[PDB]
Chain A
Amino acid sequence: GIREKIKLVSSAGTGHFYTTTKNKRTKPEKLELKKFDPVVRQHVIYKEAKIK
């Protein structure tokens, strides 16, 4: 179970987040995806943050 879990924080200022996993050994670079934000009702770039 080396594939740790992270969260994809909205860059729209909202604290909305998707949660997911990654292999931080083989993918050291940060994950950035363009996902739907249901508060703003737009597709906004999300960035990787810690699952906390």
Chain B
Amino acid sequence: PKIKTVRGAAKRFKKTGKGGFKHKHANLRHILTKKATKRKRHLRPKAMVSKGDLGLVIACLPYA
């Protein structure tokens, strides 16, 4: 049978041009008045998935 996609990781990760994955940062959903604006400003843009955790993502997202 076909492999089934982990639908949470499909809602959390997107494959880039060379095969890397972009993702949203954490810590930007609530509790936001005590955090510095510099921290939030460095949390708005999407970041790349690291080399260590890139294997678990590919295992969860077999169909790109």
Residues in chain A near residue B16, CB distance under 8 A: none
Residues in chain A near residue B33, CB distance under 8 A: 5, 19-21, 51
Chain A interface residue number, banded: under 10
Residues in chain B near residue A21, CB distance under 8 A: 33
User: Count of chain B residues with Cβ under 8 Å from any Cβ of A?
Assistant: 2
Secondary structure type dominating chain B contacts: loop
Secondary structure type dominating chain A contacts: strand
As a 0/1 sequence over residues 13 to 51 of chain B, the CB contacts with chain A under 8 angstroms (1 = contact) are 000000000000000000011000000000000000000
A20 to B32, CA, bound (A): 10
A8 to B33, CA, bound (A): 12
Q: Which of A4-36 contact B (CB under 8 A)?
A: 5, 19-21
Chain A residues packing against B (C-beta within 8 Å)? 5, 19-21, 51
